[PDB]
């Protein structure tokens, strides 16, 4: 269940999951939008669900874009902030999963966030182990897809 | 015009935004299911619009009003922390307002929430001050709906 996901993750996955955001969740515009810009630079075929954001091709310029960028990163920020509460996080990845559930998306494609936020990770110097932190944080959702 | 809303938000009324947030901001869940079940006490004509929440009268029991009203909070977090940069405040409020105009929300519905918020912040003992502050935030929103 996302239960099971979410009590799994362990202290010292929740300790590199906040050391990490404290550092790429400071600058929510800057670093949301470099998620979503990788995105669809490395999965083209992404594109296309995101037809109501316009032309993604403008990055920072398109206001769509920077808004759902922003607005993106608070997810995130909830996420994090209800790590020692599990009913609490489950609560809420839930509701976030609905919201991709009705736009038909399967659990394999929500993963491919995972490649981005590595990158992103990576350009603040955070090695594979955040990566592999922030996968963990990732298949809680996808066990409510 | 929503960029003439945001023109509204002065130096004082965004002081008596941050300083009234850090109250009611700190506990989001308790204060979030707060505001949803003195909407639905106060207004209950709109309880037909949350029908995916299922039975709302349960209060903090029900998950999926508690997912949505933790979620509720983040939203607002978000409006304070744009308050520096008027452009990006607007791009995260004409997020926010698509939301809700495909619920068919209406500028005068969305407007119900103001009493729900200042019961909220009187019972942490906010003013009608504070209550007309964060009537001039949520009237950037209406603007854009
Ligand atoms: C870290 C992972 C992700 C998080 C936290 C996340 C979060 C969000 C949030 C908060 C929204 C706004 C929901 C709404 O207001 O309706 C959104 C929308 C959406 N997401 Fe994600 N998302 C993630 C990954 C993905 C991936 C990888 C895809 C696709 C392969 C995807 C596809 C969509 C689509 C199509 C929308 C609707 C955009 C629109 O039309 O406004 N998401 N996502
Ligand atoms: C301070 C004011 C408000 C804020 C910041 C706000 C914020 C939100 C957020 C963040 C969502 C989730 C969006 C999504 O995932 O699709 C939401 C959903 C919704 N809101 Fe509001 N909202 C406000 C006031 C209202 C009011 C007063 C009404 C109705 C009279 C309303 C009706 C709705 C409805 C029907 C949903 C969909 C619930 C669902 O099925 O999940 N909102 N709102």
New interface residues.
């Given amino acids: 269940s996302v239960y099971d996901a979410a009590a799994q993750l362990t202290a010292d996955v929740k300790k590199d999951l906040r050391d990490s955001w404290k550092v790429i969740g400071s600058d929510?515009?800057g670093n949301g939008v470099a998620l979503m810009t990788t995105l669809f630079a490395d999965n083209q075929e992404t594109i296309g669900y995101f037809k109501?954001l316009g032309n993604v091709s403008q990055g920072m310029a398109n206001?769509?874009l920077?808004?759902?960028s922003?607005?993106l990163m608070?997810?995130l920020?909830?996420f994090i902030?209800?790590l020692d509460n599990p009913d609490?996080l489950?609560?809420?990845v839930?509701?976030?999963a609905?919201n991709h559930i009705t736009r038909k998306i399967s659990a394999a494609e929500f993963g491919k966030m995972n490649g981005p936020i590595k990158k992103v990770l990576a350009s603040k110097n955070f090695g594979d182990k955040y990566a592999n932190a922030w996968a963990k944080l990732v298949a809680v959702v996808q066990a409510a897809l």
Same sequence: chains 1, 2.
């Fill in positions: 929510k515009k109501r206001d769509k920077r808004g759902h922003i607005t608070y997810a920020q909830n902030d209800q609490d489950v609560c809420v839930e509701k976030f609905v």
